[PDB]
Amino acid sequence: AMEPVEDRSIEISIRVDDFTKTGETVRY
Amino acid sequence: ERNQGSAAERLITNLYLLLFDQSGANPAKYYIAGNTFIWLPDDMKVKLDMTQSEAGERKVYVVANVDNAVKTALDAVANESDLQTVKRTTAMPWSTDIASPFLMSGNKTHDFLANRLLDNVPLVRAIAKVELNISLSEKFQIVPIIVNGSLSEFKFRYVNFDKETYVVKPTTKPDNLISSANGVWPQITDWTVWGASLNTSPAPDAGTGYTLDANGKVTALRIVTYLNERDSKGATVEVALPRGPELYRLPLPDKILRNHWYKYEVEI
């Protein structure tokens, strides 16, 4: 069984990158 | 921690792809228009009609949620470095003039001869987020004067926030600064009174709020805002509490980094 020519239309996966979340306690 | 945020924070309404060749020039451009929403959100995948042999090795940039100004600038991009000159200006660069959908960018280098699929391009929001949760000590736990839900006696301002949102951060981002108020003590006439938009029960992602005890005394304050990145020091949040009022300054970090969420537990 022959596969398609390996010259295919391209695809780009995209993921939304999570925040980098930081916590800090401050007092006055 | 890594935190995926809300659906609004993740919303993609359009995409612009730039595929640079080896020399970081001659980028193939694809604008995937919001009115066509090819973009496969359910696969988190873009399909292009460029073939593997046409693509070869590419430096692939993806920009999300552009407006027409930013798009047209991207249409004129010739070199990779040009991306670091494309920026959106916001007159009042904090919430809610900065709101969803957020500008995002990311890139990856990929050889499409080797694999038709680039897995994957991490899309990084170009703005940051600041969250203050203020716990009030006894001397501030008063029955507040409330007007239309807002606290007349509790006020805040943003100091030295940057007006520019760059698509790609320059090596050293220059300054274009503004503050939300400039009134001096004791009147602080143009500072912003504390709001209650966060007190609602779906609760938006940004705003101001507060908590009252059973005696109707205010015991906590909350403020959440988006803001632009800074490579330079000086961004500040200031708050005025009833005593002229008592002013408290929270210097934000020496750098405000894109796609960072800075949460403070503040005791005053």
Numbering used by the authors:
A (entry chain A): 24 to 51
B (entry chain C): 52 to 88, 92 to 297, 309 to 333
The article reads:
Despite low sequence similarity, they have a similar architecture and are built up from five proteins each; FimA from proteins FimA-E, and Mfa1 from Mfa1-5. The next proteins, FimC-E and Mfa3-5, compose the fimbrial tip. Mfa4 is predicted to localize to the bacterial outer membrane before it is integrated into the fimbria.
This lack of knowledge is partly due to the lack of structural information; hence, we present the 1.9 Å resolution crystal structure of the P. gingivalis fimbrial tip protein Mfa4 in its precursor form. The crystals belong to space group P212121 with cell dimensions a = 54.68, b = 84.54 and c = 138.36 Å, containing two molecules in the asymmetric unit. Diffraction quality crystals were obtained after in situ proteolysis using α-chymotrypsin, resulting in a cleavage between Tyr51 and Glu52, closely mimicking the RGP cleavage that is performed in vivo after Arg53. The N-terminal extension (residues Glu26-Tyr51), which is not included in the native fimbria, forms two consecutive β-strands (β1a and β1b) that run through both the N- and C-domains of the protein. In Mfa4, the β1a strand is mainly anchored via Ile33, Ile35, Ile37, Val39, residues accommodated by hydrophobic pockets.
